[PDB]
Symmetry: C2
Subunit: 223 residues, 2 copies
């Protein structure tokens, strides 16, 4: 089917992050290999997805978004990302709800990072948000899907696109995400931190397409 976000339709269902590589040659050759169409960048540090990485308040996230919307010539596409603390890098869903509401009535097209909590993921799509992106595992933990149960509920009732964002460890992790029903996946550390970044990219490139086909194909039951 068609992978459409905020009106625009894309080919690659593999969003990819930046800033974790060793240099531009690498990130260039990598996100090139990943086959990604949308690539997110941490403003505070094709289709570019400015994300508020680094923010800890709705007020900070909201300001970073305004200041990125004007550096990108009024582009409303933003990845809201209000974290709790530099330690767990776990989302502060209360502040995220705060900022998400503010950003929506401010003309933005928000793709919001969040926990696997299915009810807060519900409200985020209600107050707007083009897409809700529950995490797979903690950021940079390379753990993969840690709560497939909650992930299924979020997908079952998702009224907007669902993207598993962050926490991925290898190809299979991403394949599984798609198999569960995600519209796309977003990763950074899994690629940029593999011994050979450019290959992991090509791997995920196939990883997310393989699982996406498997989802649509409708797998056999279990004896």
């Amino acid at each position: 089917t068609p992978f459409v976000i905020a009106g625009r339709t894309y080919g690659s269902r593999l969003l990819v992050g930046t800033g974790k590589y060793k240099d531009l040659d690498e990130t260039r050759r990598a996100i090139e290999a990943s086959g990604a169409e949308i690539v997110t960048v941490a403003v505070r540090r094709y289709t570019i997805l400015p994300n508020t990485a680094g923010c800890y308040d709705a007020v900070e996230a909201v300001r970073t978004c305004r200041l990125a919307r004007e550096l990108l010539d009024g582009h409303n596409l933003v990845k809201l990302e209000v974290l709790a603390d530099q330690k767990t890098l776990f989302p502060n869903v209360v502040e995220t709800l705060k900022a998400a509401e503010q950003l929506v009535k401010d003309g933005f097209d928000v793709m919001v990072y969040t926990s696997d909590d299915p009810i807060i993921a519900r409200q985020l799509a209600e107050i707007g948000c083009i897409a809700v992106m529950p995490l797979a595992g903690l950021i940079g933990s390379g753990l993969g899907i840690c709560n497939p149960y909650n992930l299924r509920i979020i997908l079952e009732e998702a009224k907007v696109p669902v993207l598993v964002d962050a926490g991925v460890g290898t190809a299979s992790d991403a394949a599984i995400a798609m198999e569960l029903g995600c519209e796309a996946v977003l990763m950074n550390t899994a690629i940029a931190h593999a011994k050979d970044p450019v290959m992991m990219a090509e791997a995920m490139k196939h990883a997310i397409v393989a699982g996406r086909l498997a989802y649509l194909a409708g797998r056999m039951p279990r004896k």
Copy 2:
């Protein structure tokens, strides 16, 4: 060791629920077998000897902080000013998943209202952090959805909550069998709370005895310090 909650210290680390059995004979014989000392009841849908047990009135059925807060006041006076309450603000009768925003709302109100709150919540480690900050005697993240009999669904988040827990942590609801509860204790929980796993087993009173050993076995294993994984 001693299981202490809100000053009081108990022997059984197995809290048990009510209302899921077939009759009083059953629930009586069951929570009796479970060995539980603290037994929770859904005030809004159920009105056992309080000279034998510590009763934990819970706001099951509430969907707002306003409703949970009202049920708690009306249960605090039916129990002769007892401040022990299990805050439980759910999202919808479907998922029966906690509405952490409303729970934060009510938890704050209840704490500055003299209550001793044991709060039901998600496995979100940061909201579990704030709940202990705004007061709360104990934070009780779920194991699995209520009545899903799924057990620990997110041991990762569960570990973080335990690592940074500044108050007692009780895995509440979602349990499926004995091993599920044993695992919870092994992870580091101070106690466990269940209802459906016991009252819904083919033979409720036995499952009770099972969990009775289940939570003690895992609790000893935690303290014993298990061998590594070669």
